[PDB]
Paper text:
Here, the detailed functional and structural characterization of Thermus parvatiensis prophage peptidoglycan lytic amidase AmiP, a globular Amidase_3 type lytic enzyme adapted to high temperatures is presented. Endolysins can be divided into three groups (i) peptidases that cleave the amide bonds between amino acids; (ii) glycosidases capable of hydrolysing glycosidic linkage; and (iii) amidases cleaving the amide bond between N‐acetylmuramic acid and L‐alanine at the N‐terminal portion of the stem peptide in peptidoglycan mesh (Vermassen et al., 2019). The here presented AmiP constitutes the most thermoactive and ultrathermostable Amidase_3 type lytic enzyme biochemically characterized with a temperature optimum at 85°C. The extraordinary high melting temperature T m 102.6°C confirms fold stability up to approximately 100°C. Furthermore, AmiP is shown to be more active over the alkaline pH range with pH optimum at pH 8.5 and tolerates NaCl up to 300 mM with the activity optimum at 25 mM NaCl.
Diffraction data were collected to a resolution of 1.79 Å and the structure was refined to a final R work 0.185 and R free 0.225. The structure solution by single‐wavelength anomalous diffraction revealed five independent AmiP molecules in the crystallographic asymmetric unit. The domain consists of a mixed α/β fold with a central six‐stranded β‐sheet surrounded by four α‐helices and nine loops. The active site is located in the shallow cavity of the upper end of an extensive recessed cleft defined by loops l1, l5, l8, and helix α2 across the β‐sheet. The Zn2+ ion in the catalytic site is coordinated by His17Nε2 (AmiP (B) 2.18 Å), His85Nδ1 (AmiP (B) 2.15 Å) and Glu32Oε2 (AmiP (B) 2.06 Å). One glycerol molecule (GOL) originating from the crystallization conditions serves as a bidentate ligand completing the Zn2+ ion distorted trigonal bipyramidal coordination geometry. Compared to these structures AmiP adopts a distinct compact organization achieved by omission of a helix α4′ and shortening of helix α3 as well as all β‐strands and loop l5. AmiP's compactness confirms a trait associated with adaptation to high temperatures as it was shown before that hyperthermophilic proteins are usually shorter than mesophilic homologues (Walden et al., 2004).
Author numbering: 7 to 175
Amino acid sequence: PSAYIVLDPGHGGQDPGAVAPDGTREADLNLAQALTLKEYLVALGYRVGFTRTSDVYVPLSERIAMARRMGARLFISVHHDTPTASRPGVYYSPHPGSEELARTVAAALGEGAWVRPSSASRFGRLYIDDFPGPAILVEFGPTRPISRAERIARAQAVASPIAEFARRW
Ligand code: NA
Ligand SMILES: [Zn+2]
């Protein structure tokens, strides 16, 4: 397993992440969104790997270790927010280049997009902070049913800025 960019679908298996009132699991939206994004990054000429490709829980430290073993330079975690979230955004690690990558991705996520350091999260840290490279956690808006066409639109939006970051950094 070798890859320049690693996609990390948040949660999985026994960890559903956020659950919509209709039962949509963040974990399933995450995997679906990451699978679609991989197709866009491969089309732009990048070797893409995953921390998970199925509905199984991968320990947070193993997500980071797998990325390092694959020789990843960029770590992109894929999440959806609580079902009442209004605005997409990006958390960035304190590692050099993370904030730059987050801002270029946030610029593609439309009106009201935010960026925050991992230190602004509930416990003041995120697992992405262990990755020795640019590392972000994208919250693609609220946990709710998401169509194929919306997944493709989001993938196309963020693929270009990720690929342009990877080319320049
Ligand atoms: Na862990
Ligand atoms: Zn999440």
